[PDB]
Design a protein around this ligand. Structure first.
Ligand SMILES: Cc1cn([C@H]2C[C@H](OP(=O)(O)O)[C@@H](COP(=O)(O)O)O2)c(=O)[nH]c1=O
Ligand SMILES: [Ca+2]
Length: 129
């Protein structure tokens, strides 16, 4: 996989963000995770965590996996990096997302994220408390 440039347009919620990618505005959904909706428990905390990570970043990058690059809603499907730190992993490691939506062929970082979830769960963080 390869990281590609993008710039933040605006934070949306814990697992979606609006980025400019190849010069076009797109909503990106983070691969392999599920955050609570803003109206659900830890939803606002997940939204605030993602917002902080992407807004504070000097460099955003997107990395598509091997499979589908957009979903049925036209959202980009990618791993999102903020100054080299993967947001998808960071949310799981903080107990603010569950590993989820693991589809064959877009699951390159599944083991990495499951390791993060196990750590969050052992720590009883947030969703795991
Ligand atoms: C993360 C992800 C979601 N989706 C679709 C499945 C779910 O369809 P349904 O909308 O029919 O439930 C929806 C979940 O996204 P959200 O968690 O953003 O709601 O997005 C994909 O198709 N591929 C993916 O990799
Ligand atoms: Ca969600």
């Amino acid at each position: 996989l390869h990281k590609e440039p993008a710039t933040l347009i605006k934070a949306i919620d814990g697992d979606t963000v609006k980025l400019m990618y190849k010069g076009q505005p797109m909503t990106f959904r983070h691969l392999l995770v599920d955050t609570p909706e803003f109206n659900e428990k830890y939803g606002p905390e997940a939204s605030a965590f993602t917002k902080k990570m992407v807004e504070n970043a000097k460099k955003i990058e997107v990395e598509f996996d091997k499979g589908q690059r957009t979903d049925k809603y036209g959202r980009g499907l990618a791993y999102i990096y903020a100054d080299g730190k993967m947001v998808n992993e960071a949310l799981v490691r903080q107990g603010l997302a569950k590993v989820a939506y693991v589809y064959k062929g877009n699951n390159t970082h599944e083991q990495l994220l499951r390791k993060a979830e196990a750590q969050a769960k052992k720590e009883k963080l947030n969703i795991w408390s």
